[PDB]
Paper text:
The rixosome is a large multisubunit complex that initiates RNA decay during critical nuclear transactions including ribosome assembly and heterochromatin maintenance. The central scaffold and namesake of the rixosome is PELP1 (Rix1 in Saccharomyces cerevisiae), a large 120-kDa protein that is enriched in proline, glutamic acid, and leucine residues and is a well characterized proto-oncogene whose expression is dysregulated in many human cancers. In addition to RNase PNK, the other enzymatic module of the rixosome is SENP3, a SUMO-specific protease.
To understand the structural basis for SENP3 and PELP1 association, we determined the x-ray crystal structure of the SENP3 SUMO protease domain bound to a fragment of the PELP1 IDR. Because we could not obtain suitable crystals with SENP3 on its own, we created a fixed-arm MBP-SENP3 catalytic domain fusion construct (MBP-SENP3311–574) containing a mutation at the active site cysteine (C532S). (D) X-ray crystal structure of the SENP3 protease domain (311 to 574aa, dark blue) C532S mutant bound to the PELP1SLiM peptide (764 to 781aa, teal) at 2.93 Å resolution. Residues 776 to 778 containing a well-conserved VEI motif from PELP1 form an antiparallel β-strand interface with the last β-strand (β7) from SENP3’s mixed β-sheet. Residues 765 to 767 containing a conserved FVH motif also form an antiparallel β-strand with another β-strand from SENP3. Loss of the VEI motif prevents the association of PELP1 and SENP3, while loss of the FVH motif did not prevent binding.
Author numbering:
A (entry chain A): 1 to 370, 1311 to 1574
B (entry chain B): 764 to 781
The structure:
């Protein structure tokens, strides 16, 4: 969980996290509060998963587009600044961080892609996309390339798509229409087709990512690149004399870059909400603090008017703002994440030749407008399949509760719980969604495949492997008091007396234990033997209230023999046999193994508990889950 | 050698080990 008295921050690695750490050091010098600054990979995906359970950071930094999804899930706490403080920042930045009338994060600064070019290779850089191909032929002859930039994230490739009319969500009459998506209209098709034509003309490489392009440009091996303010510092250090200029225009229209607002939200499970208020308002959002972060890796056009007016004189900031005005500001709705995913796959597949432009955008079109609840159920059941291998242990209520958490809506009313069930059933009916190929569980020597976990479904007969591993779990839950003989013990002892099991207990002195559990597998029926070592009693459990008279006699002969061969003759005598009364009793012929495992569990744990034949569907699911966890359910 | 018990006796039933 989250520690109290310490502030812990997440911010992406391409920002000035060291510069922010200097701000935290001052906070610690003036208040005694340690401030930790971490930059985990994939932190935007992580923050939901951990903030749901109370863990995670005190403060979360990301472009505003993600925060809708967080506020939808109750993960962000409401920002409460003075009107005095709110006047200090440009109003349209507070717009980026307002979700359904509430403020959910502090704006920090404004980001937009621009065209960064090598002044010495290319004193006059192209104004249009269309003239770049010939330029690249002219430079490749000189030994170097025209352009390189990140082709693995769609934020970089989007402006070309949106130039001739690509868009994400129609913004009409104040609201975003999430059913009207512009990722396969002919303008977006036009943009991406021009791009993939560059890949097929060997003017750019389809595998280029952020690191490759940055190295190319800063080493002077390529004359142009596309990036944000954060890149500039690493070029100040390089060989290159660079400028920041307007992006080229595709089909006479400006490239529309999506504009992000770096925003610091607050975890709703944070015990340090006041501390984060103080840090963000009075240390970070000052001229001094933004200066620190800006010097490590630039922020761009900061929200704090006072410092922005001092930075605005920079030609690079001016260029970034020009590109911003020609673009469109990112939405902050929860569907934005689903939009970005859809486009990332479409670009990568189109440039890799695995899909056409028209088909990749056909796919992205449907996914970006997909019903949010449906895709959530898809993800939940896919994760469940990866964890437990099948949907055998799945409870419908389980899915219902997860959805209630995510969307902060009710789902248990009949009309809604029924929709959840229908979605689950459609998921199950698709191919490959039944079980995981090669799914495995490994606990010490034991191994279970889906052929073993399958015996827990419905009214199937549990097999030897399931029973033996679950017994080892019961024993290892209280191992100084319990020892568990596997199912093969009894058949040997019955046939060949003590000599067939005389080497069974390797180094185990069963007579220092309190309880020994011995399953009894005959044909298809499972029974159980329970030895109370302290009281020297042998006791036979049958879920059908039928005693096997010879079984406890075999057990008794074995126990005396073991007392002889282990020099434990103080345990040689006093044994009495019992047929157990007042326990659960099956009505069918097929739940016997489960009855026995439950008997064992509640003999070992000695907690108040009862169950019945009618509890068996629940308990079967529970046993499955305990096995996969390699832990019993306390 | 098996024995079925019709009802549920009050306490557990002591049985022979020899
Ligand atoms: O599984 C695929 C990948 O999934 C993850 O990437 C996701 C993100 O989680 C989404 O949030 C989104 O990313 C957007 C992002 O929200 C948006 O701000 C913008 O990011 C800019 C940003 O403004 C700027 O501050 C700086 O950090 O540069 C970013 C550009 O990379 O655009 C992003 C998309 O380009 O969608 C992506 C998937 O495309 C995960 O992070 C990956 O590791 C994973 O492979
Ligand atoms: Na750094």
């Amino acid at each position: 969980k989250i520690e109290e008295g310490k502030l812990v921050i997440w911010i992406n690695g391409d920002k000035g996290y060291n510069g922010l750490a200097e701000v935290g050091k001052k906070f610690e010098k003036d208040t005694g509060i340690k401030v930790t600054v971490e930059h985990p990979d994939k932190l935007e995906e992580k923050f939901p998963q951990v903030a749901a359970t109370g863990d995670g950071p005190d403060i979360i930094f990301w472009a505003h587009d993600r925060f809708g999804g967080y506020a939808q899930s109750g993960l962000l706490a409401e920002i409460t600044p003075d009107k005095a403080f709110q006047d200090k920042l440009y109003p349209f930045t507070w717009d980026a961080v307002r979700y359904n009338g509430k403020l959910i994060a502090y704006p920090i600064a404004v980001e937009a892609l621009s065209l960064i070019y090598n002044k010495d290779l290319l004193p006059n850089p192209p104004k249009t996309w269309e003239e770049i191909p010939a330029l690249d032929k002219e430079l490749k002859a000189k030994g170097k390339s025209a352009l390189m930039f990140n082709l693995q994230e769609p934020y970089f490739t989007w402006p070309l798509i949106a130039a001739d009319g690509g868009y994400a969500f129609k913004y009409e009459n104040g609201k975003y229409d999430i059913k009207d998506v512009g990722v396969d209209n002919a303008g977006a098709k036009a943009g991406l087709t021009f791009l993939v034509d560059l890949i097929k003309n060997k003017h750019m490489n389809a595998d280029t990512d952020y690191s490759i392009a940055e190295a190319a440009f800063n080493k002077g091996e390529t004359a142009m690149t596309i990036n944000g303010p954060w890149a500039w510092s690493n070029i100040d250090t390089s060989k290159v004399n660079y400028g920041v200029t307007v992006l080229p225009t595709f089909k006479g229209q400006p490239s529309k870059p999506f504009v992000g607002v770096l925003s610091a939200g607050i975890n709703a499970a944070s015990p340090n909400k006041e501390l984060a208020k103080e840090f963000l308002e009075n240390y970070l959002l000052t001229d001094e603090g933004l200066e620190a972060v800006n010097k490590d890796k630039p922020l761009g056009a900061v929200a704090l008017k006072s410092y922005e007016e001092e930075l605005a004189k920079d030609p690079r900031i001016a260029a970034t703002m020009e590109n911003a005005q020609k673009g469109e500001i990112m939405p902050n709705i929860p569907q934005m994440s689903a939009f970005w995913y859809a486009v990332r796959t479409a670009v990568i597949n189109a440039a890799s030749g695995r899909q056409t432009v028209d088909a990749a955008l056909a796919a992205a079109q449907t996914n970006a407008a997909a019903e949010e609840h449906v895709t959530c159920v898809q993800s939940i059941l896919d994760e469940f399949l990866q964890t437990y291998g099948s949907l055998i242990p799945l409870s419908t209520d389980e899915v219902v509760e997860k959805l209630e958490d995510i969307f902060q809506q009710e789902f248990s009313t009949p009309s809604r719980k029924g929709l959840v069930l229908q979605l689950i059933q459609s998921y199950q009916r698709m191919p490959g969604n039944a079980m995981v190929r090669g799914f495995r569980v490994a606990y010490k020597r034991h191994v279970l495949t889906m052929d073993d976990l399958g015996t827990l479904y419905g009214q199937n007969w549990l097999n030897d492997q399931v029973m033996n591993m679950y017994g080892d779990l019961v024993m290892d839950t209280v191992p100084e008091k319990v020892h568990f003989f596997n199912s093969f013990f009894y058949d040997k002892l019955r046939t060949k007396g003590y000599d067939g099991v005389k080497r069974w207990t390797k180094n185990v002195d069963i007579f220092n234990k309190e309880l020994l559990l011995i399953p009894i597998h005959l044909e298809v029926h499972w029974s159980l033997i329970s030895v109370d070592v302290r009281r020297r009693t042998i006791t036979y459990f049958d879920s059908q209230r039928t005693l096997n008279r010879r079984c406890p006699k075999h057990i008794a002969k074995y126990l005396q023999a073991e007392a002889v061969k282990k020099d434990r003759l103080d345990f040689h005598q006093g044994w009495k046999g019992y047929f157990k009364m007042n326990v659960a009793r099956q009505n069918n012929d097929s739940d016997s193994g489960a009855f026995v495992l439950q008997y064992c569990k509640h003999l070992a744990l000695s907690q108040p508990f009862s169950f019945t034949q009618q509890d068996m569907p629940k308990l079967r699911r529970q046993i499955y889950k305990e096995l996969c966890h390699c832990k019993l359910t306390v | 050698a098996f024995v079925h018990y019709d009802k549920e006796e009050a306490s557990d039933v002591e049985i022979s080990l020899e």
